[PDB]
């Protein structure tokens, strides 16, 4: 994560983290729409460093510093680069649209208007195919704690690593099963996000229609991963 | 610290989402409440033993039977939730929730919760339930479906107050340490 970011959503909510003198000019209604689209980038901004922490800090340091056998790491983390480009994407359209909406002469206040067609996009057309695809390969999740469990127990240089690069407070909930489980819970946080952002929307009649639109375009997607899940076992 | 882990189960409307973020922060949400819990790793000592216990949950995955069961992995408490006024999902404990938790985590502790305990004497909460020929689930009805599904015990609380948080958290730890 790059302090920029961190900074911009370090707030517990959109209400404070702009200005309060700019919060008063707001309708009550706006405040709320507002705090849950922040929930949404703030999240997804906590996903997408979820991911970081797998592929740089995890993977990417068993491939450095350890001798495991061809297959091992893979199998530790199945599909975390496609997922990392996946959401890296995503997470860069949201900022990009917050960033367009800032007022002139100011680095935190914005009000983001339309963002049913930004999650129009998202979940669908090839974006959504290879989210589908990418989730349902979930199927490797048992058989990746399984590894992990395995290696920690019986392997002395597995466990010096995987205590060495989880020691800083800041990995305290984010060790190498809490990021397999988080990736997986990701999916499901969508619909009950854009349904509370879809509740604060009814304002402009487009906007209500494209979030709807788009709440049914994510439980169609959740649908097809969760038909298309079968674990694997080693 | 030895290394726990509660996952919290039950109906969309039982508040499970409120009950962890209400603990994790320990306050109640004054400007705003999250829509979504990720997770948190908490520290609790209980009866003097320190413990590291990690917080989960299953909301949003209700309608995903094959997503869902990947939250199982290696629990040592599960949290079964319901809401007092909430009568039906108290009936959907035995036949729905009961079944899939004793699969996927066979001898693990149960601790059956009541969650929004304040709602009980609810002006609002009372007329709206008769309308539907219903009453908010009482203390006795609570801990007779806790005997009946074979929990390690049965608890109440209020995230909205905060009152009985603390103490169905230390007590789960306290389950997960049992052997
Ligand atoms: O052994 C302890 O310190 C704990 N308390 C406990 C309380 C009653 C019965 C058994 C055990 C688990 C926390």
């Avoid at chain 1, 067609?117 to 979940?123: P, V």
């Amino acid at each position: 994560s790059m302090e920029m970011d961190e900074k911009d959503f370090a707030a517990d909510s959109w209400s404070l983290a702009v200005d309060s003198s700019f919060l008063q000019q707001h309708k009550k209604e706006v405040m709320k729409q507002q705090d849950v689209i922040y929930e949404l980038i703030q999240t997804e901004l906590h996903h997408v460093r979820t991911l970081k922490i797998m592929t740089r800090l995890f993977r990417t340091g068993m491939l450095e510093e350890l001798h495991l056998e061809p297959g091992v790491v893979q199998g530790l983390f199945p599909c975390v680069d496609e997922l990392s480009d996946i959401h890296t994407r995503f997470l860069s359209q949201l900022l990009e649209r917050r960033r367009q909406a800032l007022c002139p002469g100011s680095t935190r206040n914005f009000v983001i208007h339309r963002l049913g067609d930004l999650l129009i996009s998202q979940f669908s057309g090839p974006s959504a195919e290879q989210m589908c695809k990418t989730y349902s390969e979930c199927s490797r999740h048992s058989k990746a704690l399984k590894l992990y469990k395995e290696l920690y127990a019986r392997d002395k240089r597995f466990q010096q690593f995987i205590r060495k690069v989880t020691r800083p407070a800041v990995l305290k909930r984010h060790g190498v099963q809490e990021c397999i489980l988080l990736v997986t819970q990701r999916i499901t946080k969508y619909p009950l996000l854009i349904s509370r952002i879809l509740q604060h929307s009814h304002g402009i009649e487009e906007e209500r229609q494209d979030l709807t639109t788009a709440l049914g375009l994510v439980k169609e997607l959740l649908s097809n991963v969760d038909e298309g899940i079968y674990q694997l076992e080693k | 610290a030895i290394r726990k882990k509660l996952v919290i189960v039950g109906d969309g409307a039982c508040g499970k989402t409120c009950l962890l973020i209400v603990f994790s922060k320990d306050q109640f949400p004054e400007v705003y409440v999250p829509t979504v819990f990720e997770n948190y790793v908490a520290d609790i000592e209980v009866d003097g033993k320190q413990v590291e216990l990690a917080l989960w949950d299953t909301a949003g995955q209700e309608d995903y039977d094959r997503l869902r069961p990947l939250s199982y992995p290696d629990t040592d408490v599960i949290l079964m939730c319901f809401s007092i006024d909430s009568p039906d999902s108290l009936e959907n404990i035995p036949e729905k929730w009961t079944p899939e938790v004793k699969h996927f985590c066979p001898n693990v502790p149960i601790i059956l919760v009541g969650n929004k305990k304040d709602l009980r004497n609810d002006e609002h909460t009372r007329r709206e339930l008769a309308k539907m020929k219903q009453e908010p689930v009482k203390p006795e009805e609570g801990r007779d479906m806790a005997n009946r599904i074979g929990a390690f015990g049965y608890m109440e609380c209020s995230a909205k107050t905060k009152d009985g948080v603390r103490e169905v958290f230390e007590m789960a730890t306290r389950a997960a340490l049992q052997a």
